[PDB]
Amino acid sequence: ELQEKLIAVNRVSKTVKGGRIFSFTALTVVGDGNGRVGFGYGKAREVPAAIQKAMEKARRNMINVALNNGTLQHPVKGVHTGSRVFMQPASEGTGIIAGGAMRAVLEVAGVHNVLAKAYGSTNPINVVRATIDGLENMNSPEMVAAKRGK
RNA sequence: UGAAGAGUUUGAUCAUGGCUCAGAUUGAACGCUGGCGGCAGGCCUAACACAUGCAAGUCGAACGGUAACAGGAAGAAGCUU
């Protein structure tokens, strides 16, 4: 019962010698509703073939996000070249008021109380890369309680 | 419970990024309308000018007496006895 979505695309088609060339790309996210989120890229000679190749890569493992219960307990750094980025939990009761530019990557797991819109860049790639590569850097309750105990 | 951007300069992209944002809401105002109360507003643009009505009068119980009327009494009469 995994959930499977696009986010972004290119027009990617230029002049040459010689006439014009074109391509078909995709940036997609997948997840599993108990807490697991992931992401994958692709390309083809054709539209859905690129989406296919992209989602097939997105189906890889999916990071179990530290949720307790409907949303998550630390601002884990999504570190990139300035995105910064962080998200902010809301008090488990009001919705996913996140940036529609990157909301996908948390609605594929049904994370119901997290907000923050597109902080330092007007580009959905900038934040969607920044997040998954910094979500792997999360800590469990039992890990923050070893870090401040044993 | 505090936080969904996005049509262009491209011939395709990531940063620099004036602005329209999907209406903030005034001692705010206007056009073409006429089911409706209510709270509250009374000429910002020439502190320029003008009909007309008037913007503290009560009072004598406060020094010398006193005005039309409501009352009385004389003197004069009207015939109203």
Curated annotation (Swiss-Prot):
Impact reported for R103G: In strain: NEA-314; neamycin resistant
Keyword hit for rRNA-binding: yes
Name of protein: Small ribosomal subunit protein uS5
Similarity comment: Belongs to the universal ribosomal protein uS5 family.
Result, substituting R11L: In strain: SPCR9; spectinomycin resistant. Not a ram mutation
UniProt cross-references to Pfam families, sorted A to Z: Ribosomal_S5, Ribosomal_S5_C
A Gene Ontology cellular-component term: cytosolic small ribosomal subunit
